[model samples]
Target chain A: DIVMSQSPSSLAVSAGEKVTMSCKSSQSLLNKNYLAWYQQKPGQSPTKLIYWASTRESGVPDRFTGSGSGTDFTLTISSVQAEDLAVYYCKQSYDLPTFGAGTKLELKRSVAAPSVFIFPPSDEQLKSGTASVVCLLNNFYPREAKVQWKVDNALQSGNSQESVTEQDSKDSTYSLSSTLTLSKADYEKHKVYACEVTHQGLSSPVTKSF
Target chain B: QVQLKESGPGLVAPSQSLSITCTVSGFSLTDYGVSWIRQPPGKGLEWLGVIWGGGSTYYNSALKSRLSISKDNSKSQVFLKMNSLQTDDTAMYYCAKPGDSWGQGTSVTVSSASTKGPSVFPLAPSSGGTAALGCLVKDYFPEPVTVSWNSGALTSGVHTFPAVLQSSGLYSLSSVVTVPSSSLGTQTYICNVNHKPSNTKVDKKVEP
Candidate 1:
């Protein structure tokens, strides 16, 4: 089995910025044209982007493209947009099935009110009287984005939450995390508590808790 | 942690069929899937396919036309057969599982052995008593050839005794064994001959 990995775990780009992503295989994957790529946004299922090395999957926007052969491959997104903020994955059907770690794209910031931090993560698991879980984001890119907390997946207007950023010096990388407080009962019984973090470049809302 | 090994004739004449078997121990056939893989002297590895215990099979399309893979769950052995051989078909064959787990590979060349017959007999002691294992090696020279026995415990014992060789290159050898009766049921015993570049090991088990 070959190991697959991605570079620049997360990237921040302004609207219209040309972005590039990469995927690498431990060995040459030149057998039978077995490479593919997919895109996923927060709170949404992954969407097929490319297959057979460079053939774009149906319905994929023209801005999304893939290229390369053997052990080296690339995914290029032309002109970043607000709706394009999501993670990307690469897979190979060459020998058995193998997938690479995902890469995320994030928008810097926009005129929108700092993107309200909502509660109740998307795809969450809740235990009556014990715990309530929420998935903040399903697939997010720019890897540095965060899932803010909200009640019933609705934002508490005018509320401020604490945000922190951690850095990996060895890799020269970093990410952000935000948290919102909720009532003990709401955290235990309400299964719909979620948070929505609005960022630039993505055209859609990235929900974390589901 | 289970290890597998494939043993068979290293050379077969042109137009002749080739057969090889993989003998496995320390693992149950029901526990994992076994697959056949082949590689030419300098080519890339090709997946031949897999055989499950229930007799189901999945084969590579390129070789499915000429290949057959089967398994004997009772004996814990996997068999491979490829017919209509040519020089281009000469290569090393291996049996493996996922994740780089593999048996010691065996290489086969297209040529005929001068003499062919039952070369060796593998024996296991019944009820841990005295037993005799015999073998017939024909059309092969005899000079300081070694016969050794390997047990389920992974121990090896060489019989210092020698066999009588005939002018026609036919020879027979046997070994006597005595073991504790308590160690009797379903234990593996392997008989192996040391031939440079290609050693052969045949295994059998003791039955209550």
Candidate 2:
């Protein structure tokens, strides 16, 4: 396998801003059909985005696109979504599978809502009598926000634990967590619970269900 | 354009074997090559082996010893068989023929190792009538695994088996702790297994 090394040398823009860049492979991609693009966010595994040069992975948004042939390849994030701020790389599946150094799709400083994620705690024993829900409020600005828990659309305090906001090292942004402790009975009462968050960036509060 | 589809057994036991099939259409198996690829859940991706146009095969050095790729040209199908299975071996397996076509991911999990804790940690008499606790680890990416026996102020023997790559591309390992005679009567022995792919560390404990 040849190299797919990418460079972090980049430019940043606000959410929804367009991003364009090129990747260089050791050899030409012409008459070749083994190239693909990938996205690897911090603390997560890489995701396959584009395959066979110009073809998009099924269900991948039209905005997440690729184009090119041979040595010169392009990955364009048209209107870079907040979630797309992760690192991007290209791969070759020809002789062997090899990935390039990841390049970041920098998010320029601007008011952005925190990405909301809600999942059961690690100790969650499904169908058991115990459960804990974690609502991760990540990648927000101003370091201050409101997080609330909801059960069956009813707001409840219910063992809600809040975490102190922590700053991101790279962009100096902030993130934190809020947790809700509940019994399996509550889960039985409602199929799933939700995390509702309010931040200065959004026109309205965002809710994530789990 | 050639399309690829892969099918395999949903589960396999530790120290066991598994076989996967890759079926192609629109091209002769004798003309275009195909690769078998896998990604452990929540981990990275790689190709285990490639079957060339002439049915000759090549393997990733890491899996070369245990991996095999073959084909039935008449059926336009390719076959792969690898042995040794574990929990982490439960992954998404897909086949790709050159550039364009890819199969959707199929998820598999190996749950035969330890459905519970200490109950799965088998212990037997070893040297000097003492005991050796063996932990059978299966199915989560096992490379760079750490098997630790934590017992304060007691000297014990620790042995770890490098995870063997199962035919499914998952791993299985064995770790043993020789319970010191002095500590055998009342000491609690804990063996923690950290699997990098699964990114979790689980402890199995027993006290004689």
Candidate 3:
């Protein structure tokens, strides 16, 4: 079996951008017509792009081309489109056909409107004498946000943890999580927990409760 | 290590039985389990059943009602008998050491005029004893199949329902092995399916 390796795990690009990636096979594919390239989008079946070395499969746009030779090959997208956002893979037809790790094309995301959600502590947590509620704010702009916990409408400072705000290269969105923990007695008496998120992109504080 | 070959009859009657054999070598029959897998032309695969290394049996539930898998460890062979077969039952049948390795497959077909040969069936309570043991000896055309209960090496008893021809243009019958409440767990029951078309005599034990 040939080992296929691809560089660049993921990339962000705008529509009409040029994209190029290479796949290196451990063994020579010179004499044998055993090389192929495929493209797959999330939630859909993979489609073949190239096979038999440099020949493109039917239905693939001319912009998607295969080049290079020997054990090294390249698949280039002359111009990327919003719809061209997908993962690319190189597969081999030897002994048993095998696929290598894939590289993805992302539609660079932004600091925009954040989607906030909160998860309540389960009954099992109450039995343990403590409870923690997790709050997730996704797809917000500026990649930074403030989190505050409130009990009975009164601000309460408690032990907490927050995740690094991460960006989705595919959708141009940033997301992060924060958790607030409290004693079971306080959690039960307060019953409601509110998470307020404030981002520079928003004019007002957004609140989510569980 | 085990090696086996699947031999097919080539043609079987639509309303008859499909008898196939798995002749094996390189391993003793009693020491290994054999399973039958099939694939219709251009179709997906099917996991038929297994004759366990210990002589017990199991099926894929989808084909169990019409399938019987048994073996003769001494001969290093396993026998497969499927009744009420239709044209679509045509496929390549192969025997393998469970899911490990397989033998070359042989194709089979079913026809309208061909009368099925004699075959046997075994049924037992899924759990606990004192439950009625039943079996349907099916698909022999206008032919007589004597299905009975016999004393196996460890156990035996009798009380059998008379054999009857069912609506499928074939003879079908049910039977029970006499296992009392106290001895059911220890005593094993056996079914002797005596029919003419089968080249060899068949004696199969029924287990829960």
Candidate 4:
């Protein structure tokens, strides 16, 4: 399968802004220009916007245009609208149809930093010789965030991350929780267990310790 | 009004071929084209190929060698035949008039010669204003199965994730159906699983 690499994982833009994103294929799609673009809104199935590299799908507005060929492709929205705030994906049909990871278009003003919280292990877990600590990140925009678990200022392995990153439909912010489980003796020996979060909206890392 | 309905055997073994027919009515095969689209369990849609109204055809570049799309104007049917079937080929197959209309998908499960059924269970907490009713199917072989809720193939409010490969070499996946919490007391939800190899049909009822 040809890999479709999309850039600008997310863009914060104002209405009427002209937007352009790139999708690069691992190999040339120049044979027949078998590239397509799709727009997917939250909670909705993806709708095809352009196919055959640059041809618009029926009923798609002319404000949208697709260009480029071979290994590189571009999808441009001449003027971004409120309804155009969705994830856009590029797909290569030249091979076994591989889709790009998607580029999200969000409102510029909605980018907000997350509020981080840490919940320590319970008494029952401490008595059982094993404890699990949780790190919760809430209300962050642009939808991507990173979390690392540290024990005594050193990174720790075996952390279980969120299987699904949930988004609030109302505001489009994201919330996720990750857990680190360790032996009770390890927790007692190292009194400082920290959950460190890094986000695009945050100026500095947020650390919560217990 | 144009209508399309796809029909085919529900199961195909590995290394075999798959043949599905899209029967149409109130439409002419020479007037409108039909495109075959498929979605694997818990995955996004893929465009397989299409036969244009004039009988010319275009296929997904990757599948062109193995895929054949043709139509029978006399029978008012479009045929999709793909050889060298694999487990990954299993999906809900649908035929559409491109942007106009589509058929209710027909499910296909690909399996190896050897097969096994699965065990189903619930995966969410028992209480909330709205309940997330999950159907966990585990310990299955060949790894392709079709799951339905009640008697309908409804996909709205349903979330099915990709299958997980267990240490024991088996596969497991879950499909969740969300509904109002109050309906749990009086209503029972059925998670119907179809495993074609053993002719296995498992229907597990979920209650509050």
Most DockQ-accurate candidate = 4
Better of 2 and 4 by TM-score: 4
Whole-model lDDT per candidate: 0.55, 0.63, 0.65, 0.74
Residue A202, model 4: Cα distance from true site in angstroms: 16
Cα error of candidate 2 at position A210, Å? 17
Worst 10 residues of 4 chain B by lDDT: B122-131
Residue-level lDDT of model 3, residues A131-200, one tens digit each, is 6565666556655789988877888674665654333434545556565667788788886778998888
TM-score for model 4?
0.54
Per-residue lDDT tens digits for candidate 1, residues A32-117, read: 45777766554233455788778887557888878989988999989877678777877665765456767877665433322221
* Clash count for each candidate, listed in order shown: 43, 17, 5, 0
TM-score of each: 0.33, 0.47, 0.40, 0.54
Off by over 4 Å in 1: A1-210, B53-55, B98-100, B112-208
TM-score of candidate 1's chain B against its reference?
0.54
lDDT of 2 by residue, A1-210 (tens): 676655544556676577777777897655556788877664334457898877888668999878877777888878875566676767776656766665766565666677665654332233446555656655678668899888877888646756543234355456565656667776667765788899999899999775
Q: Interface RMSD of the predictions, in order shown?
A: 29.5, 15.0, 24.9, 8.2
Error of 4 at A143 (Å): 7.8
**Shift in Å, residue A166, candidate 1:** 48
Comparing 2 and 4 by lDDT, which wins? 4
User: What TM-score, to 2 decimal places, does chain A of model 3 have?
Assistant: 0.65
